[PDB]
């Protein structure tokens, strides 16, 4: 599946966000050397590229990337992945929250320190958490049934 | 979103299955008034139409339908909804199990008798269950969760998920 770019390859800081965009079939990683806990990293519109984020940042946003590989230190808040297919994500350090949405074939490789990661997922398929490699599948099917004696829906992993 | 049709507006019996297909912007409800628990019903490629199944059948399979309304009696096992958008399903009898997969804005209206229905959901959004209130035309509307959280439970060596 082919991403449609919106301009040239870029990496650049606007306000407090490092915007990484339109990287296609690169034979060399794109490395983010800089940026602190104050920055967000937004990676959009890329295919068959590797992106390395060296510094621990506030949050990473990855949207509309396909066949990409990410190596990251960690984040203060979260990593948000939306509408990506065939993504690999590895952490050096700590990532407390990860969110998957409308995405398929995402492999998340944790670190010793950050095994406790919370993964939110919706409308996503073929998702794996990997502990140092122990491969656990994130469920993608649920069952809901009405609790009459309590007037609410109750849901469970199927 | 406009459904890619596949032939003539069709209501016909293939082996033990009723194929109900390609009904686009029908002014009138399409009614299937025959059938028994031995039969299946497959509804494919339809848009803006009321479909009505009179008999209790084995199960019903609904695929690729958009802004449709279904009235059904009940099923022995399940109703399967796949790749559908803007769907309203109502039952007058028993439906043990419903499954929703890759579908959006689906409303399920239960009979007093069929309140205990199990809904399986994956890759699907805006799903509601509705239960008949004390007076007719009243519906208790309850939204089916479409996001979950997963953590490794270390002291147990597996993942645990729950509604967000």
- Residues of chain A with Cβ-Cβ distance to B145 below 8 Å are 142, 144, 153, 155
**Are A146 and B125 in contact (CB < 8 Å)?**
no
Let me know: does B104 contact A115? Beta carbons within 8 Å.
no
- At the topology level of CATH, where does A1-158 sit? Pectate Lyase C-like (2.160.20)
In a mutational test of the A interface, the residue from B160, B161, B163 whose CB has the highest number of chain A CBs within 10 Å is: B161
**Are B122 and A142 in contact (CB < 8 Å)?**
yes
C-beta pairs of A40-47 under 8 Å, 24+ apart in sequence: A40/A16, A41/A17, A42/A17, A42/A18, A43/A68, A43/A70, A44/A19, A44/A20, A45/A3, A45/A4, A45/A5, A45/A6, A45/A21, A46/A3, A46/A20, A46/A21, A46/A22, A47/A2, A47/A3, A47/A23
Q: Which residue of A has its CA nearest to B164?
A: A120
Method: X-ray
> What's the N-to-C CA distance of chain A in angstroms?
30
What is the residue-wise DSSP string for A103-129? -EEEEEE--STTTT-EEEEES-EEEEE
How far, in Å, CA of B18 to CA of A119, rounded?
Answer: 42
**Are A118 and B152 in contact (CB < 8 Å)?**
no
For the record, the structure tokens of A57 come out as 């940042």
**B21 min Cα distance to partner chain A (Å):** 27
C-beta pairs of B53-56 under 8 Å, 24+ apart in sequence: B56/B93, B56/B94
Task: Using CB atoms, pick whichever of B116, B118, B148 lies closest to residue A121.
Answer: B148
In a mutational test of the B interface, the residue from A136, A142, A151 whose CB has the highest number of chain B CBs within 10 Å is: A142
How far, in Å, CA of B63 to CA of B83, rounded?
Answer: 6
CATH 2.160.20.70 fits B1-164, yes or no: yes
Q: Give the number of other CB atoms < 10 A from CB of residue A1.
A: 8
Integer angstrom CA distances of residue B40 from A134, B53, B88: 43, 11, 19
- Residues of chain B with Cβ-Cβ distance to A153 below 8 Å are 129, 142-145
Enumerate residues 6+ apart whose C-beta is below 8 A from B27.
Answer: none
**Are A118 and B159 in contact (CB < 8 Å)?**
no
A156 CA to centre of own chain: 24
What count of Cα atoms within 13 Å lies in the side-chain half-sphere of residue A130?
A: 12
Q: Resolution of the coordinates in A?
A: 2.6
């Amino acid at each position: 599946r082919q991403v449609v770019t919106n301009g040239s390859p870029k990496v650049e800081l606007q306000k407090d966000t490092y915007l990484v965009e339109n990287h296609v079939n690169c034979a060399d990683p794109i490395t983010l050397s800089e940026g602190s806990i104050k920055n967000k990293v937004s990676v959009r519109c890329s295919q068959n590229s590797r992106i390395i984020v060296e510094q621990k940042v506030n949050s990473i946003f990855i949207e509309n990337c396909v066949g990409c590989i990410f190596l990251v230190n960690g984040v203060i808040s979260s990593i948000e992945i939306v509408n990506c297919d065939d993504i690999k994500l590895q952490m050096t350090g700590i990532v407390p929250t990860i969110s998957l949405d409308k995405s398929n074939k995402v492999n998340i490789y944790t670190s010793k320190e950050g095994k406790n990661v919370e993964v939110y997922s919706s409308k996503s398929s073929e998702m794996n958490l990997l502990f140092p490699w122990k491969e656990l599948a994130i469920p993608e099917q649920f069952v809901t049934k009405y609790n009459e004696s309590k007037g609410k829906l109750e849901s469970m992993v199927s």
